[PDB]
Amino acid sequence: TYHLDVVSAEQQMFSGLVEKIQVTGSEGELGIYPGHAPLLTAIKPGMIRIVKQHGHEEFIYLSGGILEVQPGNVTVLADTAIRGQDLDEARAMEAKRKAEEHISSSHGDVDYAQASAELAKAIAQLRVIELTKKAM
């Protein structure tokens, strides 16, 4: 067996002990057994098969990433969303448009909205200073 990590930029996805794995590297399918020579490659979006020692089989879907294997260790730096020449350029185009305009969105913190409006209304018009004789 060897140690396998499946790690995204956000959170970890797998950290077990494995006996072999199978992936679709950019240049073709590819099977990693223990002791495999150090290797570096990109992997295409699709499934990957893990077999945990004692032979337990499971399938993890990856949106792509980079597979790097070492003596007795291996890691899959998985992508969190599909990546591509066109998709990333569309996202950059929208990110540019939103800046050439002055269009901005609303954060989803309804709790902060509630508390902020309540505090804005409670603090409003209460003429405390000049009621208490506090100079400051």
């Binding site: 609303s106 954060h107 989803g108 309804v110 909205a113 509630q114 902020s116 409006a117 309540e118 209304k121």
Partner: protein, 117 residues
């Protein structure tokens, strides 16, 4: 005298439902103010509209207020009042504009104004 035993369960439930809808709208008003309306959940975007239509419908033109406004007054029976509010809260009129309820008499005038509007 506003309890089920003297006004009947229908009147009591209609009144308590109107008050609950208006209270929920008074709650939602400041989330609307801060985060804009397009952030509300799709059932809250419906509470908003129904409360806004209720808040219009319980205005009314008086016969003696005519000298202030020129429009004629309307007398509304309690049956029509309960029927109108009970209909609005249940979504039977989600297709009418809000201004179809402003300064009208019975709900029939609301539907007829929307048909005219």
């Amino acid at each position: 005298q506003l309890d089920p035993l003297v006004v009947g369960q229908e009147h009591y439930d209609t009144a308590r439902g109107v008050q609950s809808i208006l209270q929920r709208y008074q709650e939602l008003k400041d989330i609307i103010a801060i985060l804009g309306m397009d952030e509300l959940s799709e059932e809250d975007k419906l509470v908003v509209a129904r409360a806004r239509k209720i808040q219009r419908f319980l205005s009314q033109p008086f016969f003696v207020a005519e000298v202030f406004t020129g429009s004629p007054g309307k007398y509304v029976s309690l049956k029509d009042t309960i029927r109108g509010f009970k209909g609005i809260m249940e979504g039977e009129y989600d297709h009418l504009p809000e201004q179809a309820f402003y300064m009208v008499g019975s709900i029939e005038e609301a539907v007829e104004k929307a048909k005219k509007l």
